[PDB]
């Protein structure tokens, strides 16, 4: 009753995913946190992120369309 037999299909792949199939984002709103530079310097954060390589890191979100590059800003 609680035993479940599985059928497998293995003769050839149905699809190929990217090596970076499991990727991640940073929401664009994080760039409004005054601590942004310090936060992304965390050694713990870097170690955790390296664990997910290879991956894309997408910087975006609603704030994508409400952010302006200012080349004179410190």
């Amino acid at each position: 009753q609680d035993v479940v037999d599985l059928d497998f299909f293995t003769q050839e792949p149905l699809h190929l995913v990217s090596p970076s199939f499991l990727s991640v984002t940073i929401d664009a709103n994080l760039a409004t946190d005054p601590r942004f530079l310090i936060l992304l310097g965390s050694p713990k954060l870097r170690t955790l992120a390296r664990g997910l390589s290879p991956a894309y890191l997408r910087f975006g979100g609603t704030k994508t369309d409400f952010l302006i590059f200012d080349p004179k800003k410190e």
């Binding site: 479940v4 599985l6 699809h15 190929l16 664009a28 979100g61």
Partner: protein, 385 residues
């Protein structure tokens, strides 16, 4: 509700350095709501950023706009998909003229179609699809303000993702057949996640199932909202501590390969026992060409015992079983792998993720409300070789 803010070169630099030093490939979304008086994207600000990044030698891929389907509500302006495609063609020309070594362009980052078709996506792909390297769309199962634990455990909720994928893939196949399709921003619940739920072990059913179905249905890349940040769906909290979905993701990364196969249950499928099958990730030094990685979800309230089909029935299997740690049960923010709580060894050291070898020939025990990876060793699957 949103107003504009500025960002600096230093912010770009730190973001790029974070990605590079972590072995990640940065995709940067450009602002699509800078418009000319004749209704076109104004590329002036992006040009400054592209020039800056090129001068620094940064290898960055690009997007333009986020969820353009909601520009009318969020910003009081309607940009149709044909116009957005024209804007993407302009951005493509700027990337071609730059010194970037073959920067890629992804878009249009539309929201999920819900109960409608993907109309803006279709018009965008007709107009601008030739210049994008992959189609991006977004998905959330539920509203974080109202989601409950029951919802996070509900196979009917999980199954709603299938129809969303089908609708998007239909539009892509009808306009740009074969173009790669990516989830460009996705998680359990919108509105910043469901408090007390999106950061728990219980969030893992939606995350693992989404990965399994995405792979099975032809999505090539899935981008988890968010690695780190304010939302409850973060993989890492703002104390920099990994939540259960981080550990789930790390195990997935280490065990699941790129070749997608298929598994299914024999007999009645109540949709609570959900199974996925890939070749094992060859980069893992424990394993070898031909090995299989089965991953499985049990949303029943009792243990289920999985029996593998011949010739895998009597192979050596390595178990990686995840269960919540502590009195919060499924609402815990800590998780155990084969009975050992997963925690960093120190700030620079991930723990070993050790398998539990099972007795060859034994059925795979999957406890109630759990998920696991099983590596079938010496599977010698030619398709994995």
């Amino acid at each position: 509700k949103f107003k504009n803010s500025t960002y600096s070169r230093s912010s770009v630099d730190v973001l790029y350095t974070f990605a590079k030093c972590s072995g990640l490939d940065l995709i940067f979304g450009l602002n699509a709501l800078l418009r000319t008086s004749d209704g076109q994207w104004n590329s002036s600000n992006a040009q400054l950023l592209l020039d800056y990044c090129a001068s620094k030698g940064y290898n960055i891929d690009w997007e333009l706009g986020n969820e353009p389907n909601s520009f009318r509500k969020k910003a009081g302006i309607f940009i149709n998909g044909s116009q957005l495609g024209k804007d993407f063609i302009h951005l493509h020309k700027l990337l071609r003229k730059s010194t970037f070594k073959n920067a890629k362009l992804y878009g249009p980052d539309v929201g999920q179609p819900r109960g409608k078709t993907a109309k803006m996506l279709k018009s965008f792909l007709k107009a601008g699809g030739e210049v994008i390297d992959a189609v991006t769309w977004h998905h959330y199962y539920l509203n974080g303000r109202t989601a409950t634990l029951e919802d996070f455990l509900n196979p009917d909720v999980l199954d709603t993702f299938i129809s969303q994928v089908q609708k998007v893939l239909q539009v892509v196949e009808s306009t740009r057949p074969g173009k790669k399709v990516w989830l460009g921003e996705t998680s359990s619940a919108y509105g910043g996640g469901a408090p007390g739920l999106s950061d728990t072990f219980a969030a893992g059913f939606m995350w693992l199932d989404k990965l399994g179905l995405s792979a099975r249905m032809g999505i090539e890349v899935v981008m988890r909202q968010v690695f780190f940040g304010a939302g409850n769906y973060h993989l890492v909290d703002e104390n920099f501590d990994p939540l259960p979905d981080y550990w789930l993701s790390l195990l997935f990364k280490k065990l699941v390969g790129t070749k997608v196969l298929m598994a299914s249950v024999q007999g009645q499928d109540r949709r609570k026992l959900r199974v996925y099958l890939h070749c094992t990730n060859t980069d893992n030094p424990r394993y070898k060409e031909g090995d299989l990685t089965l991953y499985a979800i049990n949303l029943h309230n009792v243990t289920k015992y999985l029996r593998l089909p011949y010739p895998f029935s009597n192979k050596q299997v390595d178990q990686y079983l995840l269960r919540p740690h502590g009195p919060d049960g499924l609402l815990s923010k800590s998780v155990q792998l084969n009975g050992q709580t997963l925690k960093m060894v120190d700030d620079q050291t991930l723990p070993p993720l050790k398998p539990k070898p099972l007795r060859p020939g034994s059925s795979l025990g999957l406890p109630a409300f759990s998920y696991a990876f099983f590596v079938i060793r010496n599977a010698k699957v030619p398709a994995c070789i």
